[PDB]
């Protein structure tokens, strides 16, 4: 039971930390190679490069290949960010983090091959469906909770949670993507980053911050998942900041009482008082009334039936140009 | 027939111009007064002020009341824009322009009372439904065509057409709203304005422009109505401009042939060559193949059945503060 759960997580998190430190320090370099994947179709694009749907010639598995054009990355000054994501990503291992299956580079480009998640991002389902019900939202919250719990024990702080980076999988579960802001930080950090509407009052107030930033982000999420829109927004970030800074939310009436209370303990301006920050940390979140019905090990195990499960002219193809090129810069990749 | 139509419009446009010049020059000042309307509920808000759903105590009619707070307008430097819209609006009169039923001011505020259009804006139906069919889109285009034809003969150039300012009425027809960019200009103008994605290559290239800007805007519209998204877009206006400037559109395959051709004559970078600008003007648009099936007088008469017809916690009320105040500035209102 309970104690017995605690028992378990403890043990787990500990073994987990051992594997992470190992990788963290003794990495992973040139896993596969281009030629070993067949090119199926452009899934999307963007600065940095285009993201392709590929299938691994032997294995017949499908992956999503992110192709970063070295030169572009360098120009947009995203070297450090690119190398740190590769690093974090090949070190970590958790049911709800998308997986970095293979990595490689060539004259021209950097390649990151993750596990293909067809359902897409929550963001779009969210705006289309409108609102998620307290229970649908709770399923997703449960998953994030755990992830944060894990992530944090590795001194990592995800710094950009928002529906846009949570993709829905074949079984209805979440997968956290894109770690280009994560930081391993045993302490306080100061850089200013993330998305406006999710930013913690501390980040903008320029005081240095820590793990607690992601627990205030959690609060915006459940709020936007259950409301339909975020607790603070305005067209013009400045404006937004202002509001986040007063820390004055208006919960919709259909909220629960129980959900308001949790929200109010997450949407805390005072770190001292924020749930997630107190001596007990997670525990304060997992023991909340709002989560009473939640089987956490059950969720860690994908054992719970999920409530939702996702199921135009196409692109204008092109050609991995591959033609050393920025070689000093990306040596660590 | 045809000739006979031509006959008519001629006559019409002429009489129309006579009424417009009259008002243009001999206006309309303090029509109603606050007390004569009961306050039903906030429909929306914003800088400048909030927009209310009111009902005219005697008459029992519903209006939408725009309340502009003099001080705010002055601070955001929108005096000239506010007075010119009031002016244009009380001068004009056309089946598809929302109506300025009453106007007034008081110590505190400026009041513009238009006809209430419950269906909302096309923008939202558009993004929800997704795409409009060549025929649904054609119905809307037909209406805009006419409006532009009218508007222009009064030397007015609307300078901001986009799905967001076209509201759908009770019978499925369009109503053009918000004229805070319109200009009466017998000639070329130079100010830089409108929405990025609808901007004419000339506006951004800073060469002075004229009526033709609204015919290039028409082209973006039918394009976004039929495609789902605009012919030029990018996250970051700069980017957008660039593309508009090359004037290189990609029509989706489901387009018609006939619709491509019209589009290509509207999405013309060369004014010399743009449909709407040539000797014949409108005529080049109304005689296009894409519109062959269109009964224009029929449409002017709302005689055609429309294809679509439109049919959360509420606001946090407040209080017309009314408490002279900016009196020099808004004298002309």
């Amino acid at each position: 039971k309970k104690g017995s759960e605690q028992e378990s997580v403890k043990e787990f998190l500990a073994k987990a930390k051992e594997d992470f430190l190992k990788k963290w320090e003794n990495p992973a370099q040139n896993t596969a190679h281009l030629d070993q994947f067949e090119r199926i179709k452009t899934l999307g694009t963007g600065s940095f490069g285009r993201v392709m749907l590929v299938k691994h010639k032997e294995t017949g598995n499908h992956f999503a290949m992110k192709i970063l054009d070295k030169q572009k990355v360098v120009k947009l000054k995203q070297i450090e960010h690119t190398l740190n994501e590769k690093r974090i990503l090949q070190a970590v291992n958790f049911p709800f983090l998308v997986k970095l299956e293979y990595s490689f580079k060539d004259n021209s480009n950097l390649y990151m091959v993750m596990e293909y998640v067809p359902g897409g991002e929550m963001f779009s389902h969210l705006r289309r469906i409108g609102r998620f019900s307290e229970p649908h939202a709770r399923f997703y919250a449960a998953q994030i909770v755990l992830t944060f719990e894990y992530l944090h024990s590795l001194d990592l702080i995800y710094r950009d949670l928002k529906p846009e980076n949570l993709l829905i999988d074949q079984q209805g579960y979440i997968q956290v993507t894109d770690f280009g802001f994560a930081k391993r930080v045993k302490g306080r950090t100061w850089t200013l980053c993330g998305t406006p509407e999710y930013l913690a009052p501390e980040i903008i107030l320029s005081k240095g911050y820590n793990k607690a930033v992601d627990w205030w982000a959690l609060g915006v999420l459940i709020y936007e998942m259950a409301a339909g829109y975020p607790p603070f927004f305005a067209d013009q970030p400045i404006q937004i900041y202002e509001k986040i800074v007063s820390g004055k939310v208006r919960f919709p009436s259909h909220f629960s009482s129980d959900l308001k209370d949790l929200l109010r303990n997450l949407l805390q301006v005072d770190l001292t008082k924020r749930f997630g920050n107190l001596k007990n940390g997670v525990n304060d979140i997992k023991n909340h009334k709002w989560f009473a019905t939640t089987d956490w090990i059950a969720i860690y195990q994908r054992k719970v039936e999920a409530p939702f499960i996702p199921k135009f002219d196409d692109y204008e193809e092109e050609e991995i140009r591959v033609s050393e090129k920025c070689g000093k810069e990306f040596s660590e990749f | 027939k045809k000739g006979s139509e031509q006959e008519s419009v001629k006559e019409f446009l002429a009489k129309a111009k006579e009424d417009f010049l009259k008002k243009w020059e001999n206006p309309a000042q303090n029509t109603a007064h606050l007390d004569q309307f009961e306050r039903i509920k906030t429909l929306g808000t914003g800088s400048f002020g909030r927009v209310m759903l009111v009902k005219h105590k005697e008459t029992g009619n519903h209006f939408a009341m725009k309340i502009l707070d003099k001080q705010k307008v002055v601070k955001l430097k929108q005096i000239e824009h506010t007075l010119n819209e009031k002016r244009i609006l009380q001068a004009v009169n056309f089946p598809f322009l929302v109506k300025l039923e009453y106007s007034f001011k008081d110590n505190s505020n400026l009041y513009m009372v238009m006809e209430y259009v419950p269906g909302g804006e096309m923008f939202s139906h558009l993004r929800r439904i997704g795409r409009f069919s060549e025929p649904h889109a054609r119905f809307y285009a037909a209406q805009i065509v006419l409006t532009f034809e009218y508007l222009h003969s009064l030397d007015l150039i609307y300078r901001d057409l986009k799905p967001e300012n076209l509201l759908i009425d009770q019978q499925g027809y369009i109503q053009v709203t918000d004229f805070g960019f319109a200009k009466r200009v017998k000639g070329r103008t130079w100010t830089l304005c409108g929405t990025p994605e609808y901007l004419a290559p000339e506006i951004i290239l800073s060469k002075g422009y004229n009526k033709a800007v609204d015919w290039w805007a028409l082209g973006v519209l039918i394009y976004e109505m039929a495609a789902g998204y605009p012919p030029f877009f990018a996250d970051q206006p700069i980017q957008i401009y660039e593309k508009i400037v090359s004037g290189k559109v990609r029509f989706p395959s489901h387009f018609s042939s006939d619709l491509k051709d019209l589009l290509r004559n509207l999405l013309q970078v060369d004014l010399t060559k743009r449909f709407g600008n040539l000797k014949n003007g409108v005529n080049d648009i109304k005689n296009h193949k894409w519109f062959a099936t269109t009964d224009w007088i029929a449409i002017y008469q709302r005689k055609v059945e429309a294809p679509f017809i439109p049919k959360f916690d509420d606001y946090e009320e407040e209080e017309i503060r009314v408490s002279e105040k900016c009196g020099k500035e808004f004298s002309e209102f």
Binding site: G194, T195 | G44, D313
Partner: peptide, 18 residues
């Protein structure tokens, strides 16, 4: 704050980072 005001802002699409 409210649905009507949020679906009127420009912020209903994917938001970027800073």
């Amino acid at each position: 704050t409210t649905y009507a005001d949020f679906i009127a802002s420009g912020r209903t699409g994917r938001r970027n980072a800073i």
